[PDB]
Amino acid sequence: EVQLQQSGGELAKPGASVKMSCKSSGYTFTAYAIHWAKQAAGAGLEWIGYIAPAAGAAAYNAAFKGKATLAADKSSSTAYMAAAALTSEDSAVYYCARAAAAGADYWGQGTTLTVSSAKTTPPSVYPLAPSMVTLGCLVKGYFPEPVTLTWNSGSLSSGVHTFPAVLQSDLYTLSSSVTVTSSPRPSETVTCNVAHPASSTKVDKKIV
Amino acid sequence: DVLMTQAPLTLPVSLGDQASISCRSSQAIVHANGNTYLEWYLQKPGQSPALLIYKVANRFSGVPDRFSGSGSGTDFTLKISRVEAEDLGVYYCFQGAHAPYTFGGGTKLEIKRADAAPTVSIFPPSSEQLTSGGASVVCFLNNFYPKDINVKWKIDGSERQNGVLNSWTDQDSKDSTYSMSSTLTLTKDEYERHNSYTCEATHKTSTSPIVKS
């Protein structure tokens, strides 16, 4: 099927450059243009530009053309966005999206770019133990965003609440809760599965 | 550049009711070829934007029929009839006629539901953490409405506003409730020279405080 696969997370130093990729599959890559869209923590969405792999032509939002270069490699069905002269204002989630006749019908999952000189720090994952019972997972002191949380590898989806992270002393902390029935714990094993893309780390914490 | 002015900024609506969002361009968005590339997208929490309408009024395949778009020139509207809870999120108009393409500022659609009191819980630091030298006291205020809620931390009776950070979730697509997490971080050492820990929650439901300790 049609899929645009990005990389959900990378850290880059101020002043450096970063090249993000969007690998398309499931269709004829050269027949659609690939566009890039920026979403900052509170700036709405901004169109960065597009590249037409068939012709080679890339169009740019002139507001960012001096720090942005778009390319495409038909042979590997990948579109790239390279940002240069990075500043903290460049930190955001960036999505690639396909377009031709409709609008943007399929979108990548988004890649969170963080521009900072801080080092990458994996999260410490602590289990949270206590009619109805509310369990938890504390994901503390990691950098940069994002972190994803799953319960029982996907098998447990309903009844979950994952909170947005809060920054403090230059590290993020987030929490996830999961209200499940009493007849379940502990008979049926349960586990918090945490992933921190930027450090390529995955942690499984079974409850108490 | 074409400015896309969206109204309203926030759109609370009861389930079942109709909702309308407008978008106005600062100049015409009719393409040289006579086509108007005005689209509407929905950004649901935790997901990538999703296309609803393209070319002003054409519903994208798979979009429920309760969504419709209309308009021309510089004035466009997205209509949602019989609003459902799964419709929550930020809607954006977008013009793909003139470079640089631009998006509206967004409209956050929120479901208005019956006020519900929060469900309050508290969790002391976990053994594994303490060893480290930290002590995190966690309070969950799950499934309430509306969004506004209050929380106050008191050690053995004395408040404690510094050290406590709070995080709210977006509205829940299943029950239209909001939830929040408040975390009072203190040192492993100071955690040991204190006894009771309190977490309060003052909502709009019951005028009687919600304490867990």
Side-chain angles (χ1 to χ4, degrees):
Chain A
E1 164 181 283
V2 180
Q3 296 187 199
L4 285 188
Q5 311 132 280
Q6 294 182 254
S7 192
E10 47 204 343
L11 182 50
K13 302 283 148 253
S17 282
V18 65
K19 183 167 191 190
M20 293 181 204
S21 63
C22 173
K23 174 205 190 175
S24 114
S25 57
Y27 71 98
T28 302
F29 179 65
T30 61
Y32 292 62
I34 287 299
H35 290 58
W36 292 86
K38 177 183 189 179
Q39 171 196 60
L45 299 167
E46 303 172 62
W47 174 84
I48 298 153
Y50 68 74
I51 177 140
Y60 299 85
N61 176 317
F64 317 122
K65 80 154 191 334
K67 52 200 191 62
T69 304
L70 303 183
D73 180 3
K74 327 170 114 178
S75 78
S76 69
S77 294
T78 301
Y80 302 90
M81 182 187 59
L86 292 173
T87 76
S88 68
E89 194 173 88
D90 289 317
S91 295
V93 170
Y94 289 83
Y95 299 87
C96 52
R98 195 177 75 153
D105 63 343
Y106 288 82
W107 290 69
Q109 225 65 288
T111 298
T112 294
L113 171 60
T114 297
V115 180
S116 174
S117 61
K119 73 304 320 162
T120 291
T121 304
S124 285
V125 177
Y126 307 123
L128 292 180
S131 180
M132 215 67 191
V133 59
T134 50
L135 300 181
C137 197
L138 170 57
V139 178
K140 195 169 167 195
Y142 67 83
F143 183 90
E145 289 269 56
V147 144
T148 49
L149 176 45
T150 271
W151 289 89
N152 294 358
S153 287
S155 305
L156 197 139
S157 159
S158 173
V160 294
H161 288 291
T162 294
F163 308 80
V166 176
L167 180 62
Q168 133 146 286
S169 296
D170 304 70
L171 291 290
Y172 293 88
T173 295
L174 149 171
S175 44
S176 183
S177 87
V178 57
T179 303
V180 71
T181 34
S182 311
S183 325
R185 223 270 264 68
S187 181
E188 309 242 296
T189 171
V190 181
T191 310
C192 176
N193 321 129
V194 182
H196 184 236
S199 63
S200 293
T201 293
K202 135 185 150 58
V203 183
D204 296 45
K205 240 27 160 305
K206 29 176 162 190
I207 312 61
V208 287
Chain B
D1 304 346
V2 184
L3 167 57
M4 299 290 281
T5 298
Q6 233 180 288
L9 168 75
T10 309
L11 169 24
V13 55
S14 295
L15 277 329
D17 289 347
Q18 297 195 74
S20 181
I21 304 171
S22 82
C23 176
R24 190 147 207 213
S25 45
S26 63
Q27 47 185 279
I29 53 182
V30 171
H31 191 82
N33 61 27
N35 270 180
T36 293
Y37 296 104
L38 184 111
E39 297 137 39
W40 287 92
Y41 293 93
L42 167 61
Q43 177 89 57
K44 289 176 178 160
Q47 302 191 55
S48 282
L51 175 61
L52 301 175
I53 303 293
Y54 62 94
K55 275 178 181 180
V56 183
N58 305 274
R59 202 185 296 102
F60 175 56
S61 179
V63 180
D65 71 300
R66 77 229 241 222
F67 287 92
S68 61
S70 62
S72 56
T74 69
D75 192 37
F76 307 89
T77 298
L78 205 220
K79 246 285 177 52
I80 303 184
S81 73
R82 287 56 190 63
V83 172
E84 287 173 27
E86 314 76 75
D87 297 344
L88 281 163
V90 187
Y91 287 82
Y92 292 86
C93 48
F94 170 88
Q95 63 90 10
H98 307 304
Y101 302 143
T102 49
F103 288 94
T107 295
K108 186 177 228 308
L109 189 141
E110 161 202 332
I111 297 295
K112 213 81 174 246
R113 231 201 61 158
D115 326 54
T119 281
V120 193
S121 185
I122 189 178
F123 308 79
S126 47
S127 59
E128 40 275 302
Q129 190 192 186
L130 281 314
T131 77
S132 314
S136 275
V137 190
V138 180
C139 196
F140 291 148
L141 287 65
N142 287 351
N143 312 76
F144 55 94
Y145 184 84
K147 187 119 206 177
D148 256 83
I149 185 158
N150 185 291
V151 190
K152 185 157 54 177
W153 289 86
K154 296 185 298 195
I155 209 307
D156 301 314
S158 56
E159 290 112 301
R160 170 165 292 295
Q161 248 197 302
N162 283 180
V164 177
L165 320 90
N166 305 148
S167 178
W168 268 251
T169 71
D170 296 280
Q171 192 168 30
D172 175 275
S173 316
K174 287 298 94 187
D175 63 358
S176 306
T177 60
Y178 288 95
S179 288
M180 77 106 73
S181 197
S182 180
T183 297
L184 160 63
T185 286
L186 42 67
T187 68
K188 164 190 63 73
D189 306 308
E190 85 185 64
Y191 170 64
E192 288 318 272
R193 59 166 45 40
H194 285 295
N195 179 214
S196 45
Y197 291 99
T198 286
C199 176
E200 261 153 28
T202 301
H203 208 204
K204 174 180 192 176
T205 50
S206 52
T207 308
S208 167
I210 318 187
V211 187
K212 261 61 202 77
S213 58

